[PDB]
Design a protein around this ligand. Structure first.
Ligand SMILES: C[S@@+](CC[C@H](N)C(=O)[O-])C[C@H]1O[C@@H](n2cnc3c(N)ncnc32)[C@H](O)[C@@H]1O
Length: 424
C-alpha cells in the first residue's frame, strides 16, 4: 500500500538494466528475510541464527564489487543451512551483478520496519507482488502462479479438515497450501492445532527460486516458525514415501524441459512423455485409500489416445472421479489455456461423473470481467447439492450434468472431453 508502488518502481528500474521481475523478487526476498532477522534481534532479544559477519548490518557497510562479493558470500553460507533458513536460500544465487543497483534494493529494504507492520500487511504486500509478476503478459512468471479465486473454490469444495495431510506436489508460490491452512485454522484442537502447525502441509517444487518465494510467502502469513513445509524436489523422479489425505495442485501445463533427467517410475501405470499425464499418474499414486484430490489439468488429459486412455480407465476403476469442472478461457497468465479441475477420491469405483461447464458462453479476461470468487458460487453450490440442473427438455443449456460411467466407458478413447451446451 504505497510500499507496493515503491517495490514496483524499483522493478522497472532494474528491468532498465538487464534484470527481470522474477529475478528482482527473489533478490528482494533474500534481502527481506535477512533484514527481518536483524529486526527480530532488537524487537525481541534473542541470538540471530544468521552467522556472524553476514547479518544485515555487515551487508549495508560495503559499496563496490566488494558489496557484490559480501552479498554473494552471504547467500552461499545461508544456502548451506538447514530448516526454514536453508529453504529460503535454496541454491541461493545473486542475479544483480551491478553494485549501484543492488545497493538500491538493499537501501529500499533497509529504510522500512517490516516486523511491526500488521502481519496481515506483510502477507498481502507479498501476495500482491507475486500476483503482479504472475499475471505479467510478457514476463512468463504465470507458469509459477494460479489465480486465487480458483484456488479458493477448489479448497472450499475439497473442504480440508483439521487432522488431515495436504500436499501440493507442484506448488509454485504456495497458494493451495496457504489457502488450505487458512481454511483449517478456523475450525474446532489441541493434538490437531499442533498437527496443522507441524504436520499437515507439504509442498514440492523443482525450481529453487520458486521454493524461495513459496517458503517466504507461507512464513509471511505465519505458517511455520523454524521449519518450512516446502521442499525443492522433482516430484516425478521418485515414488512417494508417504501417502496423503488431500491433494491440491495446478501442475505444469508445459513440457518437461529438455535435458531434464529421464524419469524411472515402475510404479506408474503407463510410460508416456506427456508431462501432464505423468503428474496425474504421480498424484493418483500419492493418495491414501479414502483420500481425495482437486487438480487443474488441460483438455488433452481428457482426450488423448494411448497412455491417456489407459490412465482414464484406471481412474474410473480404482478411483471415484465424481466431478469435472470445465474452466473458462481468460483466467490464466497465458490465456488460450483449455483447463479443467478434476476432483476424485481413491478406493471406490466411479459410478457417475458430474460435469460443470463454466466455459461455454462464459467471458472472463485478465483486464476486463476478471474472475473473482463469486463467479464460482453456483459451481460450489452444485458441488455440495448433487441435483442436476441439466434436463433434456426442461433445461438443455444447464451447466451441471450427471453422466453414468457406462456412457463414458462407451465413448471413443474413453474420452472425458464432454460438452453439451449450444452456444446458439
Ligand atoms: C502453475 S505452478 C503452481 C502455482 C501454484 N498453484 C501457486 O499458488 O502459485 C506449477 C509449478 O510446478 C513446478 N514444476 C514444474 N515441474 C515440476 C516437477 N517436475 N516437480 C515439481 N514441481 C514442478 C513449476 O516450477 C511451477 O511453479
Amino acid at each position: 500500500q504505497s510500499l507496493t508502488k515503491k517495490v514496483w518502481n524499483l522493478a522497472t528500474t532494474l528491468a532498465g538494466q538487464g534484470i527481470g521481475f522474477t529475478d528482482y523478487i527473489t533478490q528482494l526476498t533474500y534481502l527481506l528475510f535477512l533484514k527481518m532477522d536483524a529486526e527480530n534481534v532488537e524487537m525481541f532479544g534473542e541470538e540471530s541464527a544468521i552467522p556472524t559477519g553476514y547479518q544485515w548490518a555487515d551487508l549495508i557497510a560495503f559499496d563496490g564489487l566488494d558489496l557484490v562479493k559480501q552479498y554473494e558470500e552471504t547467500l552461499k553460507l545461508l544456502s548451506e543451512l538447514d530448516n526454514l533458513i536453508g529453504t529460503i536460500y535454496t541454491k541461493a544465487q545473486n542475479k544483480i551483478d551491478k553494485p549501484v543497483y543492488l545497493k538500491k534494493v538493499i537501501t529500499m529494504i533497509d529504510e522500512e520496519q517490516w516486523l511491526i507492520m500488521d502481519g496481515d500487511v506483510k502477507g498481502a504486500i507479498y501476495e500482491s507482488i507475486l500476483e503482479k509478476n504472475g499475471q505479467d503478459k510478457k514476463s512468463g512468471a504465470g507458469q509459477y502462479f494460479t489465480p486465487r479465486p480458483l484456488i479458493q473454490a477448489m479448497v472450499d469444495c475439497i473442504n480440508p479438515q483439521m487432522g488431515e495431510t495436504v500436499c501440493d506436489p507442484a506448488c509454485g508460490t504456495g497458494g493451495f497450501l496457504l489457502t488450505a491452512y487458512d481454511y483449517m485454522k478456523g475450525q474446532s484442537s489441541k493434538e490437531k492445532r499442533d498437527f496443522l502447525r507441524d504436520k499437515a502441509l507439504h509442498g514440492v517444487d523443482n525450481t529453487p527460486l520458486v521454493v524461495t518465494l513459496a517458503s517466504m510467502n507461507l512464513y509471511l502469513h505465519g505458517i511455520g516458525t523454524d521449519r518450512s513445509p516446502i521442499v525443492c524436489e522433482d516430484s516425478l523422479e521418485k515414488e512417494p514415501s508417504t501417502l496423503v489425505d488431500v491433494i491440491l495442485a495446478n501442475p505444469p501445463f508445459g513440457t518437461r524441459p529438455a535435458g531434464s533427467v529421464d524419469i524411472n517410475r515402475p510404479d506408474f501405470y503407463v510410460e508416456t512423455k506427456n508431462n501432464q499425464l505423468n503428474f496425474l499418474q504421480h498424484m493418483m499414486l500419492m493418495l491414501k485409500t479414502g483420500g481425495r484430490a482437486a487438480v487443474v489439468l488441460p483438455d488433452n488429459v481428457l482426450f488423448e489416445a494411448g497412455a491417456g486412455e489407459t490412465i482414464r480407465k484406471r481412474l474410473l476403476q480404482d478411483f471415484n472421479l465424481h466431478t469435472i469442472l470445465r474452466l473458462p478461457t481468460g483466467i490464466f497468465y497465458a490465456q488460450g489455456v483449455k483447463a479443467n479441475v478434476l476432483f476424485f477420491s481413491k478406493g471406490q469405483p466411479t459410478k457417475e461423473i458430474w460435469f460443470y461447464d463454466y466455459r461455454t458462453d462464459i467471458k472472463h479476461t485478465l483486464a476486463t470481467n476478471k474472475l473473482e470468487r463469486h463467479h464460482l458460487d453456483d459451481f460450489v453450490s452444485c458441488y455440495n447439492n448433487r441435483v442436476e440442473i441439466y434436463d433434456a427438455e426442461n433445461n438443455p443449456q444447464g451447466r451441471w450434468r450427471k453422466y453414468p460411467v457406462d456412457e463414458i466407458i462407451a465413448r471413443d478413447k474413453t474420452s472425458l472431453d464432454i460438452t453439451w451446451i449450444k452456444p446458439g
